[PDB]
Amino acid sequence: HSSGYTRPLRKPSRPIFIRPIGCDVCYGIPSSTARLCCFRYGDCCHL
Numbered sequence: 158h159s160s161g162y163t164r165p166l167r168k169p170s171r172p173i174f175i176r177p178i179g180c181d182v183c184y185g186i187p188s189s190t191a192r193l194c195c196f197r198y199g200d201c202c203h204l
Contacts, residue, residue, distance in 0.1 A: 176198065179193075179194055180194035180198040180200045180201065183200055183201035183204060184204070186201065191204070
């Protein structure tokens with residue numbers, strides 16, 4: 158809260174890319190990863 162001032166160099170819009178592993182395998186992954194894959198990506202929700 159109440160910060161001073163900061164403006165470091167920043168890159169432009171990044172190019173698209175495939176997603177990380179875990180969500181690409183709704184079956185076989187752990188329940189904790191499956192919940193995260195459904196909460197963030199939206200996959201492995203109704204198994």
